């Protein structure tokens, strides 16, 4: 069973931009994940928060709750939350970093990920399909 | 109506310094902002927190509560919260960034504002009057 | 009375950009400042020059000519004239720095102000209204 | 039909390192791409070269050969070949960047990709499976 | 009486590494601090949180609650929370900064502390005994 | 009609160096420019100042006076005058930046032009012939 | 006789953009240089490659084949090919660097040229006329 | 037995400052260190030099003289003497680095300890009591 | 005969600070320099300006008016006017750079002098005596 | 048996300067290394190319061809070619980097070697004798 | 009386260079400095040393020896010896820094002085005469 | 004859590491150099000191003692001793820089040598044979 954790501002998906983030809402996104996982023999729980400390605790406590991997979009936290980096290093599950947009075709600061060094890997730029790619890697491993 | 939001540590105005911040308290600051809005035909609501998450949520939900504009003093978050920047970008209201002190006459790191790129404008160094001036701009607009 | 000093290129306001600057000309900004000033118990005189030396001389001399404060738009000199910085520090009047545009949403070089540290505060982003705001601060003080 | 292109040194897959790269060889990687591609509806062709010019050439010419998208692992060239960047930009297919290793857990210079800004997206860190996730995104789109 | 405050991830001590952190748990740590305190004429209260906002709150409030000093290990927030810095500068109590590990023999970003400048001093690298040394300084002062 | 403008120190062509500049004077430079304009059918006025403010007024006022294009050598102002950059962006004439020497074979500070981003093009290293190539571009366009 | 050498990607002139490069193709560009050279009494040979080592072999060899000078557009290799720099420094012919676009109004990396310190001069911005200006310098010289 | 070692300028404690360094002298310092050692079962010797080479020799040699640990205050050499660093790494005793003042509250260059990465730990800012703290750690180990 | 040239803001000597600049006026400074000249056999003339242009012209012309040397205090222009630098380089007289205050004990930007590399030397920190020391050098040479 | 590889422009040895490279040819340099090899019972082969991708294949393939060791002068590629780095790390032979000039006594960019971290050692500044020194090392080893 | 102290390599004055340093030896420099002092009523001792430690002790102990001022040429230690900087801060005498050569006209690393901030001032460029300049300042003060 | 000079810590060769420096002592290294030289027609003497001062004096005096070249291992002084650099520049003998380890494969501060630019050349990475390589170059020269 896999936990999908989303950081700040991902609750406003749908309203926030046209041609930067796309049309799909946070709800439409979980329902996509539920299905991608389901076809593929993976159960999924999906969560979002705007609080660093709540994101950290979800990552700390995923192994205790019986999940066996995390798919994690930290939102803008990916560029500065060393506390989230220490949370992922301090816990045993594999973590896959996911982003809707290509961080390398926007502002300079988005190009640097403080969480990515502790993750299994990173997928980004594929809209909603980034999440799906992570689920296909998780299913095989 | 306009929402005035304040970041960490501004709850302690009055006792943090006397040559850095002034003597006016956060309570007196709101009362000033209420009277300024009111002379001028602007309903105000004034809020403060020490939590990045809570600041984010208040900027995010502000338009859904009926507010027409936000006046925003992120406190030290101004210099590192890309999550707060994204919050302001993800919502439709004009945001005016305000600071009591002149950011350019203190430590180097205060000189950089990560939220300011997404605001209508910035006002700083005037003490409580930076809030005043934000309200005059907003009434006119 | 207050002295309103404008740096290079601000003589070309109106014809220079539609969205960056606006359509309001230098002639109309001065008429707007005279009326903002007036209702309101502040006399203003309004000057523009393309010469660093002329701007410096006007800041150095304002106190001897009776003025009680300076509102100052250095134009692009704000990002390199340390001569102007030292001029404002060499004289006793409070100086308010003002910019039509939001300096933090344009080229990186525009984000750094060398005059700003010696100013009482800074206002930027609000078009002609940045000037109005500096005046409301000054009238109260 | 999708062109999978690989840069310098990936011909030595299987012999460079244990921990860093893993055991699968360039030949086993094309057959794995062959099968991941067929199983799911996609004809693939897989090329590798040690020459920057050759890579630039294969990406320029791909759409004229009737390919519909490029999967691209530039090898170390990802960190400095702006001529490859220009090549991907000068031509109309979507390019997905792919790497075997997690770039952000190795040397600092690995962390920056000059090709990434012109790609649809990037997937990295999943061993041979990074190529598979590239192919599932491409199949859907 | 002394407040001992801990930031993010210290709740996971015991499980996160062996020869980075060791095996002593947060729980065992507090009982160590109680005991070291007790020999030595000092009452301790020990607290831990994964939220910047709550660490900030407790440092702001420690003096109202009657503490005479803070011993503070911010966890990874030490590298980036300019809000915590400000919280420490905003309240009267001496703060001693403590870390289990030597920050200078680990990754580059762990070497810069944005809190240390407002602290009385820093002790780091002696594992749990870093806490003990802070308490020995506080008992003598 | 085209305006050829020269900034500080170019009045001293003749006696500054042998190897850096060569032996042609400003006077002989303008006579060369007059001949090169004539043969090819372009009226030229040639000017020089040591004053930043004067160069700026000249670039501001050129369209109004009836010139169609500016050939511009700002001298050392090239590496720092952002006010000259804005002068050039504030006016509709195309501007061609020119230099007698190859700015990239001298001091490091000479390599960066702050005026060049706003110019149609730049030509440097060809001695007096830089001005001529600028004239041959503009006669054609 | 002069050699005009063109680096990578310049073979796709015509389909890369409209506003960045314009419509004229590599074949139309060589035609133009043929004619411009003929109207000038200069013979020209025109070449293009995607390979660094091939560009290098042409500049090295040129003086052996009887050429008097080289007009050189390295494409993106102008921002990192120190081997090209060394090629131009190891041979006696004068080299003029040429670019279609104004490097200084594009991406930051485009603004540094590692070939330019070794060239007689640089002309950039003027589209296919950059090459015309280079030939006019050279005919005089 | 433990060897306390002290680098340049520390011989002048007492006259050098009152609130930067405080008033206690070198002599008074060794006396406090002997008392702190001697209730507590540690013999200590205490040494100071203005010469890098002499400090280097003392660290090299301490294990030969029978010492079990080094307490080390390199004075300014902490910010630049890699030879000291390599001395601490060339020998097997553990080294505690100690500083009377808080290195993070002073000049920029004082924040980088080149010796620290090789030490068990560091204690700074507690005046003379920094030495005490290093001793209690060492008594325990 | 020697020419002593003074840049911006030095005309306000007297009132600008007490412990930064001290109490002597520009007037009194030129008298002191008049006398220091004569005890020493040197005619002096003393000029101040606020315009970079005018300092530039004065330096360029000094030799034509009959002067044999220049003592120069460029004011804040020392940190940025590469045009001044070029002026000193384009003329044959020896130039001594002088500053009243110690540029190394003030803001970080004051420590870089762009004019110094072309001066015979620099004297800085000695108040009005900086000028005296320059004259003593020049009377010897 | 040892393989000695030379990168771009080392074929022009004899014509590039009298004081930078001196007068000995590539021809004379391979004769020279065949003799230093033969004197000391080392068999040698000597190759040179202008193409990054050829150097890379030669270093990748040397063990396959039965060489025991490489000596490698990358030419200008030592400063930017991470692809050559990875070729060296991908194959099991020891590589000694060699250069004719002292890199540290030329341009800044020449001081950094991106190859040398994966080489046994580096020798540079001894002209042709640099290759010889690398042979006497490989002999012993 | 004043103490003139000289750091490494200045014992070799006279055979290091012709156009950098001069031909005057260390013994001739002393004889000069003695005379310059005496004629003016100011006694002098002059010393030189190659050891940092020895220079430091000479600065530390100068007030104790009855001297009233120090004239200091630290030699290359000026660009890195913070221990010397601290030595100058630790003792009550005024210190004038002096350099034979113009530091701003050599290699970049020479342009930063770590001792200058603690000195009354700095004089450099004037050969032997920089010492003369320092003595005339000291005699008047 | 040739003088071989060793800096700090190199006396402890043998017990410092295995994998960084190996097992051979400074005693055994000097035996090794004695043989290498005598075998090869070269007198050698071999010195080591922990003091920057003493290394400088040995390099300064060497040409006076009749030696005719220096082999020089600065130890960690190679990364910061500009005083050593100037010693090597002030004396006429060719100096060769030698290190046991490859500086480019260790911590980042070791990659930069401030001495290397004044040296004939450098050899590093070959343990004890680095010295041998040095000797053979000098034998020829």
JSON list of C-alpha atoms in Angstrom, two decimals, chain K:
[
{"chain": "K", "resi": 1, "resn": "UNK", "atom": "CA", "xyz": [59.28, 56.89, 19.21]},
{"chain": "K", "resi": 2, "resn": "UNK", "atom": "CA", "xyz": [57.72, 54.73, 16.45]},
{"chain": "K", "resi": 3, "resn": "UNK", "atom": "CA", "xyz": [58.17, 51.04, 15.51]},
{"chain": "K", "resi": 4, "resn": "UNK", "atom": "CA", "xyz": [58.30, 50.04, 11.82]},
{"chain": "K", "resi": 5, "resn": "UNK", "atom": "CA", "xyz": [57.65, 46.31, 11.26]},
{"chain": "K", "resi": 6, "resn": "UNK", "atom": "CA", "xyz": [57.99, 44.36, 8.07]},
{"chain": "K", "resi": 7, "resn": "UNK", "atom": "CA", "xyz": [56.80, 40.93, 7.17]},
{"chain": "K", "resi": 8, "resn": "UNK", "atom": "CA", "xyz": [57.96, 38.19, 4.87]},
{"chain": "K", "resi": 9, "resn": "UNK", "atom": "CA", "xyz": [60.19, 38.49, 1.86]},
{"chain": "K", "resi": 10, "resn": "UNK", "atom": "CA", "xyz": [61.02, 42.16, 2.38]},
{"chain": "K", "resi": 11, "resn": "UNK", "atom": "CA", "xyz": [64.57, 41.16, 3.46]},
{"chain": "K", "resi": 12, "resn": "UNK", "atom": "CA", "xyz": [65.09, 40.51, -0.32]},
{"chain": "K", "resi": 13, "resn": "UNK", "atom": "CA", "xyz": [64.14, 43.96, -1.52]},
{"chain": "K", "resi": 14, "resn": "UNK", "atom": "CA", "xyz": [66.49, 44.90, -4.31]},
{"chain": "K", "resi": 15, "resn": "UNK", "atom": "CA", "xyz": [66.83, 41.59, -6.13]},
{"chain": "K", "resi": 16, "resn": "UNK", "atom": "CA", "xyz": [63.08, 40.74, -6.39]},
{"chain": "K", "resi": 17, "resn": "UNK", "atom": "CA", "xyz": [62.15, 42.48, -9.75]},
{"chain": "K", "resi": 18, "resn": "UNK", "atom": "CA", "xyz": [62.90, 45.89, -11.49]},
{"chain": "K", "resi": 19, "resn": "UNK", "atom": "CA", "xyz": [59.51, 47.44, -12.40]},
{"chain": "K", "resi": 20, "resn": "UNK", "atom": "CA", "xyz": [57.45, 45.95, -9.57]},
{"chain": "K", "resi": 21, "resn": "UNK", "atom": "CA", "xyz": [59.51, 46.64, -6.38]},
{"chain": "K", "resi": 22, "resn": "UNK", "atom": "CA", "xyz": [62.63, 48.70, -7.14]},
{"chain": "K", "resi": 23, "resn": "UNK", "atom": "CA", "xyz": [66.34, 48.37, -6.47]},
{"chain": "K", "resi": 24, "resn": "UNK", "atom": "CA", "xyz": [66.37, 49.92, -2.94]},
{"chain": "K", "resi": 25, "resn": "UNK", "atom": "CA", "xyz": [67.37, 47.28, -0.36]},
{"chain": "K", "resi": 26, "resn": "UNK", "atom": "CA", "xyz": [65.94, 46.61, 3.06]},
{"chain": "K", "resi": 27, "resn": "UNK", "atom": "CA", "xyz": [68.99, 48.29, 4.74]},
{"chain": "K", "resi": 28, "resn": "UNK", "atom": "CA", "xyz": [68.60, 51.37, 2.55]},
{"chain": "K", "resi": 29, "resn": "UNK", "atom": "CA", "xyz": [64.83, 51.48, 3.40]},
{"chain": "K", "resi": 30, "resn": "UNK", "atom": "CA", "xyz": [65.65, 51.50, 7.12]},
{"chain": "K", "resi": 31, "resn": "UNK", "atom": "CA", "xyz": [68.29, 54.21, 6.75]},
{"chain": "K", "resi": 32, "resn": "UNK", "atom": "CA", "xyz": [65.65, 56.27, 4.83]},
{"chain": "K", "resi": 33, "resn": "UNK", "atom": "CA", "xyz": [62.85, 55.67, 7.35]},
{"chain": "K", "resi": 34, "resn": "UNK", "atom": "CA", "xyz": [65.30, 56.65, 10.23]},
{"chain": "K", "resi": 35, "resn": "UNK", "atom": "CA", "xyz": [66.16, 59.89, 8.49]},
{"chain": "K", "resi": 36, "resn": "UNK", "atom": "CA", "xyz": [62.52, 60.74, 7.59]},
{"chain": "K", "resi": 37, "resn": "UNK", "atom": "CA", "xyz": [61.55, 60.26, 11.19]},
{"chain": "K", "resi": 38, "resn": "UNK", "atom": "CA", "xyz": [64.49, 62.11, 12.74]},
{"chain": "K", "resi": 39, "resn": "UNK", "atom": "CA", "xyz": [64.17, 65.28, 10.64]},
{"chain": "K", "resi": 40, "resn": "UNK", "atom": "CA", "xyz": [60.82, 65.54, 11.96]},
{"chain": "K", "resi": 41, "resn": "UNK", "atom": "CA", "xyz": [61.45, 64.92, 15.75]},
{"chain": "K", "resi": 42, "resn": "UNK", "atom": "CA", "xyz": [60.29, 61.26, 15.59]},
{"chain": "K", "resi": 43, "resn": "UNK", "atom": "CA", "xyz": [62.63, 58.36, 16.58]},
{"chain": "K", "resi": 44, "resn": "UNK", "atom": "CA", "xyz": [62.35, 55.01, 14.86]},
{"chain": "K", "resi": 45, "resn": "UNK", "atom": "CA", "xyz": [63.16, 51.40, 15.19]},
{"chain": "K", "resi": 46, "resn": "UNK", "atom": "CA", "xyz": [62.80, 49.23, 12.17]},
{"chain": "K", "resi": 47, "resn": "UNK", "atom": "CA", "xyz": [62.50, 45.40, 12.12]},
{"chain": "K", "resi": 48, "resn": "UNK", "atom": "CA", "xyz": [61.71, 42.65, 9.55]},
{"chain": "K", "resi": 49, "resn": "UNK", "atom": "CA", "xyz": [60.73, 38.98, 9.91]},
{"chain": "K", "resi": 50, "resn": "UNK", "atom": "CA", "xyz": [59.62, 36.06, 7.79]},
{"chain": "K", "resi": 51, "resn": "UNK", "atom": "CA", "xyz": [57.54, 34.49, 10.64]},
{"chain": "K", "resi": 52, "resn": "UNK", "atom": "CA", "xyz": [53.88, 35.40, 11.22]},
{"chain": "K", "resi": 53, "resn": "UNK", "atom": "CA", "xyz": [54.26, 34.59, 14.88]},
{"chain": "K", "resi": 54, "resn": "UNK", "atom": "CA", "xyz": [57.21, 36.81, 15.28]},
{"chain": "K", "resi": 55, "resn": "UNK", "atom": "CA", "xyz": [55.35, 39.71, 13.54]},
{"chain": "K", "resi": 56, "resn": "UNK", "atom": "CA", "xyz": [52.40, 39.12, 15.82]},
{"chain": "K", "resi": 57, "resn": "UNK", "atom": "CA", "xyz": [54.51, 39.28, 19.01]},
{"chain": "K", "resi": 58, "resn": "UNK", "atom": "CA", "xyz": [56.19, 42.43, 17.76]},
{"chain": "K", "resi": 59, "resn": "UNK", "atom": "CA", "xyz": [52.77, 44.07, 17.34]},
{"chain": "K", "resi": 60, "resn": "UNK", "atom": "CA", "xyz": [51.51, 42.76, 20.69]},
{"chain": "K", "resi": 61, "resn": "UNK", "atom": "CA", "xyz": [54.53, 43.99, 22.64]},
{"chain": "K", "resi": 62, "resn": "UNK", "atom": "CA", "xyz": [55.24, 47.34, 21.04]},
{"chain": "K", "resi": 63, "resn": "UNK", "atom": "CA", "xyz": [53.27, 49.51, 23.57]},
{"chain": "K", "resi": 64, "resn": "UNK", "atom": "CA", "xyz": [55.12, 47.70, 26.42]},
{"chain": "K", "resi": 65, "resn": "UNK", "atom": "CA", "xyz": [58.39, 48.70, 24.83]},
{"chain": "K", "resi": 66, "resn": "UNK", "atom": "CA", "xyz": [57.44, 52.34, 25.00]},
{"chain": "K", "resi": 67, "resn": "UNK", "atom": "CA", "xyz": [56.71, 52.91, 21.33]},
{"chain": "K", "resi": 68, "resn": "UNK", "atom": "CA", "xyz": [53.83, 55.16, 20.50]},
{"chain": "K", "resi": 69, "resn": "UNK", "atom": "CA", "xyz": [52.82, 54.00, 17.02]},
{"chain": "K", "resi": 70, "resn": "UNK", "atom": "CA", "xyz": [53.50, 51.17, 14.54]},
{"chain": "K", "resi": 71, "resn": "UNK", "atom": "CA", "xyz": [54.10, 51.51, 10.75]},
{"chain": "K", "resi": 72, "resn": "UNK", "atom": "CA", "xyz": [53.31, 47.96, 9.33]},
{"chain": "K", "resi": 73, "resn": "UNK", "atom": "CA", "xyz": [54.06, 46.30, 5.97]},
{"chain": "K", "resi": 74, "resn": "UNK", "atom": "CA", "xyz": [52.89, 42.70, 6.57]},
{"chain": "K", "resi": 75, "resn": "UNK", "atom": "CA", "xyz": [54.11, 41.59, 3.18]},
{"chain": "K", "resi": 76, "resn": "UNK", "atom": "CA", "xyz": [51.93, 38.85, 1.64]},
{"chain": "K", "resi": 77, "resn": "UNK", "atom": "CA", "xyz": [50.36, 38.16, 5.08]},
{"chain": "K", "resi": 78, "resn": "UNK", "atom": "CA", "xyz": [48.23, 41.14, 4.45]},
{"chain": "K", "resi": 79, "resn": "UNK", "atom": "CA", "xyz": [45.95, 39.01, 2.24]},
{"chain": "K", "resi": 80, "resn": "UNK", "atom": "CA", "xyz": [45.31, 36.20, 4.73]},
{"chain": "K", "resi": 81, "resn": "UNK", "atom": "CA", "xyz": [46.66, 36.59, 8.32]},
{"chain": "K", "resi": 82, "resn": "UNK", "atom": "CA", "xyz": [43.66, 37.25, 10.51]},
{"chain": "K", "resi": 83, "resn": "UNK", "atom": "CA", "xyz": [45.99, 36.39, 13.44]},
{"chain": "K", "resi": 84, "resn": "UNK", "atom": "CA", "xyz": [47.88, 39.56, 12.55]},
{"chain": "K", "resi": 85, "resn": "UNK", "atom": "CA", "xyz": [44.61, 41.45, 12.32]},
{"chain": "K", "resi": 86, "resn": "UNK", "atom": "CA", "xyz": [43.66, 40.30, 15.77]},
{"chain": "K", "resi": 87, "resn": "UNK", "atom": "CA", "xyz": [47.14, 41.23, 17.01]},
{"chain": "K", "resi": 88, "resn": "UNK", "atom": "CA", "xyz": [46.62, 44.74, 15.88]},
{"chain": "K", "resi": 89, "resn": "UNK", "atom": "CA", "xyz": [43.16, 44.91, 17.61]},
{"chain": "K", "resi": 90, "resn": "UNK", "atom": "CA", "xyz": [44.55, 43.48, 20.82]},
{"chain": "K", "resi": 91, "resn": "UNK", "atom": "CA", "xyz": [46.86, 46.44, 21.63]},
{"chain": "K", "resi": 92, "resn": "UNK", "atom": "CA", "xyz": [46.35, 50.20, 22.08]},
{"chain": "K", "resi": 93, "resn": "UNK", "atom": "CA", "xyz": [48.76, 51.78, 19.55]},
{"chain": "K", "resi": 94, "resn": "UNK", "atom": "CA", "xyz": [47.68, 53.46, 16.34]},
{"chain": "K", "resi": 95, "resn": "UNK", "atom": "CA", "xyz": [48.84, 51.45, 13.26]},
{"chain": "K", "resi": 96, "resn": "UNK", "atom": "CA", "xyz": [49.52, 52.69, 9.77]},
{"chain": "K", "resi": 97, "resn": "UNK", "atom": "CA", "xyz": [49.67, 50.16, 7.00]},
{"chain": "K", "resi": 98, "resn": "UNK", "atom": "CA", "xyz": [52.10, 50.73, 4.25]},
{"chain": "K", "resi": 99, "resn": "UNK", "atom": "CA", "xyz": [52.90, 48.97, 0.92]},
{"chain": "K", "resi": 100, "resn": "UNK", "atom": "CA", "xyz": [55.63, 49.74, -1.51]},
{"chain": "K", "resi": 101, "resn": "UNK", "atom": "CA", "xyz": [53.54, 48.74, -4.53]},
{"chain": "K", "resi": 102, "resn": "UNK", "atom": "CA", "xyz": [50.07, 49.70, -5.68]},
{"chain": "K", "resi": 103, "resn": "UNK", "atom": "CA", "xyz": [48.09, 46.64, -4.51]},
{"chain": "K", "resi": 104, "resn": "UNK", "atom": "CA", "xyz": [45.22, 47.40, -6.95]},
{"chain": "K", "resi": 105, "resn": "UNK", "atom": "CA", "xyz": [47.43, 46.96, -9.93]},
{"chain": "K", "resi": 106, "resn": "UNK", "atom": "CA", "xyz": [48.68, 43.35, -9.49]},
{"chain": "K", "resi": 107, "resn": "UNK", "atom": "CA", "xyz": [46.95, 40.02, -9.05]},
{"chain": "K", "resi": 108, "resn": "UNK", "atom": "CA", "xyz": [43.36, 39.97, -7.70]},
{"chain": "K", "resi": 109, "resn": "UNK", "atom": "CA", "xyz": [44.20, 38.28, -4.37]},
{"chain": "K", "resi": 110, "resn": "UNK", "atom": "CA", "xyz": [46.53, 41.23, -3.52]},
{"chain": "K", "resi": 111, "resn": "UNK", "atom": "CA", "xyz": [43.59, 43.72, -3.56]},
{"chain": "K", "resi": 112, "resn": "UNK", "atom": "CA", "xyz": [42.06, 42.47, -0.27]},
{"chain": "K", "resi": 113, "resn": "UNK", "atom": "CA", "xyz": [43.80, 43.47, 2.95]},
{"chain": "K", "resi": 114, "resn": "UNK", "atom": "CA", "xyz": [42.72, 41.72, 6.13]},
{"chain": "K", "resi": 115, "resn": "UNK", "atom": "CA", "xyz": [44.65, 44.00, 8.47]},
{"chain": "K", "resi": 116, "resn": "UNK", "atom": "CA", "xyz": [43.59, 47.32, 6.90]},
{"chain": "K", "resi": 117, "resn": "UNK", "atom": "CA", "xyz": [40.23, 47.63, 8.74]},
{"chain": "K", "resi": 118, "resn": "UNK", "atom": "CA", "xyz": [42.00, 47.87, 12.12]},
{"chain": "K", "resi": 119, "resn": "UNK", "atom": "CA", "xyz": [44.62, 50.41, 10.96]},
{"chain": "K", "resi": 120, "resn": "UNK", "atom": "CA", "xyz": [44.29, 54.25, 11.14]},
{"chain": "K", "resi": 121, "resn": "UNK", "atom": "CA", "xyz": [44.94, 54.21, 7.52]},
{"chain": "K", "resi": 122, "resn": "UNK", "atom": "CA", "xyz": [46.72, 52.84, 4.57]},
{"chain": "K", "resi": 123, "resn": "UNK", "atom": "CA", "xyz": [49.29, 54.08, 2.17]},
{"chain": "K", "resi": 124, "resn": "UNK", "atom": "CA", "xyz": [50.47, 52.30, -0.87]},
{"chain": "K", "resi": 125, "resn": "UNK", "atom": "CA", "xyz": [52.13, 52.59, -4.19]},
{"chain": "K", "resi": 126, "resn": "UNK", "atom": "CA", "xyz": [54.82, 55.09, -3.56]},
{"chain": "K", "resi": 127, "resn": "UNK", "atom": "CA", "xyz": [57.87, 52.85, -3.12]},
{"chain": "K", "resi": 128, "resn": "UNK", "atom": "CA", "xyz": [60.00, 53.74, -0.04]},
{"chain": "K", "resi": 129, "resn": "UNK", "atom": "CA", "xyz": [58.11, 56.93, 0.14]},
{"chain": "K", "resi": 130, "resn": "UNK", "atom": "CA", "xyz": [54.89, 55.13, 1.43]},
{"chain": "K", "resi": 131, "resn": "UNK", "atom": "CA", "xyz": [56.89, 54.90, 4.74]},
{"chain": "K", "resi": 132, "resn": "UNK", "atom": "CA", "xyz": [57.72, 58.51, 4.57]},
{"chain": "K", "resi": 133, "resn": "UNK", "atom": "CA", "xyz": [54.04, 59.37, 4.17]},
{"chain": "K", "resi": 134, "resn": "UNK", "atom": "CA", "xyz": [53.13, 57.27, 7.22]},
{"chain": "K", "resi": 135, "resn": "UNK", "atom": "CA", "xyz": [55.82, 59.00, 9.34]},
{"chain": "K", "resi": 136, "resn": "UNK", "atom": "CA", "xyz": [54.64, 62.50, 8.44]},
{"chain": "K", "resi": 137, "resn": "UNK", "atom": "CA", "xyz": [51.11, 61.48, 9.55]},
{"chain": "K", "resi": 138, "resn": "UNK", "atom": "CA", "xyz": [52.34, 60.10, 12.75]},
{"chain": "K", "resi": 139, "resn": "UNK", "atom": "CA", "xyz": [54.49, 63.05, 13.60]},
{"chain": "K", "resi": 140, "resn": "UNK", "atom": "CA", "xyz": [51.64, 65.45, 13.30]},
{"chain": "K", "resi": 141, "resn": "UNK", "atom": "CA", "xyz": [49.35, 63.17, 15.37]}
]
